[PDB]
């Protein structure tokens, strides 16, 4: 789970750098959690994967 289904946040790519300065490719994954989002106030909770940024920004609705 590295892509947000709302904003499309993909994982960034970079290097993990050691004390000896060996740089080894690693991934900054988004913090996306399984959220049972409620599209309409009705109540049917459809499961999706949303980044914590969207959860904090209120683009998810766990109604």
């Amino acid at each position: 789970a590295a892509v947000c289904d709302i904003c499309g946040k993909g994982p960034g790519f970079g290097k993990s750098v050691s004390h000896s300065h060996r740089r080894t490719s690693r991934r900054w994954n988004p913090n996306i959690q399984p959220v049972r989002a409620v599209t309409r106030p009705g109540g049917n909770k459809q499961r999706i994967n949303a980044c914590t940024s969207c959860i904090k920004a209120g683009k998810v609705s766990r109604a």
């Binding site: 409620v38 959860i55 904090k56 209120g58 998810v60 609705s61 766990r62 109604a63």
Partner: protein
């Protein structure tokens, strides 16, 4: 999260009381269960919140109140106004559960909520005593009927 309550909650306030509670609490318990609303605008979260609190307190149903309200809804025919064509009848708009609820209130009397009427099930596309059902309780239907006239 700054939000004004719509009902009474413990140490969170009362209906209309503003409080800041953390995002998880608001987002998962309050906004879902309808016990509060985020204060986008102070005047809004005040007046809309108060209206919602009163409306819930007035539209609450009960076990025996369920059958009593079924009896009350078994009164007559309600009527709604929406613009149609010259003869086609293709309504310019479309009935809503809110429309049906308010029409029932203003004509018949009985107070109730949007989680009563089966509006789509009662396709209401033209005019006349198109019937609708208010699901008063777990299994208490009510074929309240609803005429349609020009707006």
């Amino acid at each position: 999260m700054k939000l004004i309550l719509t009902a009474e909650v413990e140490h969170l306030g009362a209906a209309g009381d503003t409080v800041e509670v953390k995002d998880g609490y608001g987002r998962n318990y309050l906004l879902p269960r309808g016990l509060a609303i985020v204060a986008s605008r102070g005047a809004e979260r005040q007046a809309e919140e108060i209206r919602r609190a009163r409306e819930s307190k007035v539209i609450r149903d009960i076990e025996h109140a369920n059958e009593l309200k079924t009896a009350l809804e078994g009164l007559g025919d309600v009527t709604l106004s929406v613009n149609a064509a010259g003869d086609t009848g293709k309504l310019f708009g479309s009935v809503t559960a809110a429309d049906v609820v308010n029409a029932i209130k203003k004509a018949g009397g009985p107070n109730l909520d949007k989680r009563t009427v089966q509006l789509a099930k009662a396709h209401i596309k033209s005019v006349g005593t198109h019937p609708v059902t208010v699901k008063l309780h777990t299994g208490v239907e009510a074929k309240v009927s609803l005429n349609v006239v020009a707006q």
